Design an enzyme around this catalytic site. Sequence first.
Site, PDB file in Angstrom:
ATOM      1  N   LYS A 284      16.742 -67.439 -61.478  1.00  0.00           N
ATOM      2  CA  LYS A 284      17.852 -68.406 -61.236  1.00  0.00           C
ATOM      3  C   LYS A 284      18.479 -68.127 -59.870  1.00  0.00           C
ATOM      4  O   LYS A 284      18.917 -69.030 -59.181  1.00  0.00           O
ATOM      5  CB  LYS A 284      18.914 -68.248 -62.328  1.00  0.00           C
ATOM      6  CG  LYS A 284      19.554 -69.607 -62.619  1.00  0.00           C
ATOM      7  CD  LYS A 284      18.581 -70.468 -63.427  1.00  0.00           C
ATOM      8  CE  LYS A 284      19.142 -71.885 -63.560  1.00  0.00           C
ATOM      9  NZ  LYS A 284      18.017 -72.859 -63.642  1.00  0.00           N
TER      10      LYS A 284
ATOM     11  N   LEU B 100      16.930 -67.163 -57.281  1.00  0.00           N
ATOM     12  CA  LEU B 100      15.995 -67.671 -56.231  1.00  0.00           C
ATOM     13  C   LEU B 100      16.080 -69.212 -56.176  1.00  0.00           C
ATOM     14  O   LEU B 100      15.712 -69.861 -57.134  1.00  0.00           O
ATOM     15  CB  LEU B 100      14.555 -67.265 -56.575  1.00  0.00           C
ATOM     16  CG  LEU B 100      14.491 -65.783 -56.969  1.00  0.00           C
ATOM     17  CD1 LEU B 100      13.050 -65.423 -57.345  1.00  0.00           C
ATOM     18  CD2 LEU B 100      14.955 -64.904 -55.794  1.00  0.00           C
TER      19      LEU B 100
ATOM     20  N   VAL C 169      12.641 -70.787 -56.902  1.00  0.00           N
ATOM     21  CA  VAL C 169      12.186 -70.791 -58.329  1.00  0.00           C
ATOM     22  C   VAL C 169      13.329 -71.292 -59.215  1.00  0.00           C
ATOM     23  O   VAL C 169      14.411 -70.737 -59.214  1.00  0.00           O
ATOM     24  CB  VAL C 169      11.779 -69.373 -58.792  1.00  0.00           C
ATOM     25  CG1 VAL C 169      10.623 -69.483 -59.787  1.00  0.00           C
ATOM     26  CG2 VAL C 169      11.322 -68.510 -57.607  1.00  0.00           C
TER      27      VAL C 169
ATOM     28  N   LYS D 239       7.874 -70.940 -66.339  1.00  0.00           N
ATOM     29  CA  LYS D 239       6.644 -70.100 -66.245  1.00  0.00           C
ATOM     30  C   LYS D 239       7.048 -68.654 -65.949  1.00  0.00           C
ATOM     31  O   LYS D 239       6.436 -67.718 -66.430  1.00  0.00           O
ATOM     32  CB  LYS D 239       5.754 -70.624 -65.116  1.00  0.00           C
ATOM     33  CG  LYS D 239       4.844 -71.729 -65.655  1.00  0.00           C
ATOM     34  CD  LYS D 239       3.506 -71.125 -66.084  1.00  0.00           C
ATOM     35  CE  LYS D 239       2.894 -71.976 -67.198  1.00  0.00           C
ATOM     36  NZ  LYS D 239       1.761 -71.238 -67.823  1.00  0.00           N
TER      37      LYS D 239
END
EC number: 2.7.7.7
Length: 87
Positions: free
Chosen positions: A60, A62, A65, A72
């Site tokens: 979270k 990042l 991502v 994933k």
Amino acid sequence: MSKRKAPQETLNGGITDMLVELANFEKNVSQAIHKYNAYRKAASVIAKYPHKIKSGAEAKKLPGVGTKIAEKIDEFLATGKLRKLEK
């Protein structure tokens, strides 16, 4: 293939490995899809990261991502809650 001696059950993280793998699909994932680039950008902020988390809070943090890729990141880091033998 076979460099020196890799672990049998990997270490713990394995984030940038399974993220870069989806981009390496070269079959189900073309070479210019939106979801395809989702693992490439997230893999740039994860592989640079220590790439090893017990929960899904680091992903979270990042910005790369988190857009459907954080799911994933938990798929590999979902079975990382095993006991470590107490006493």
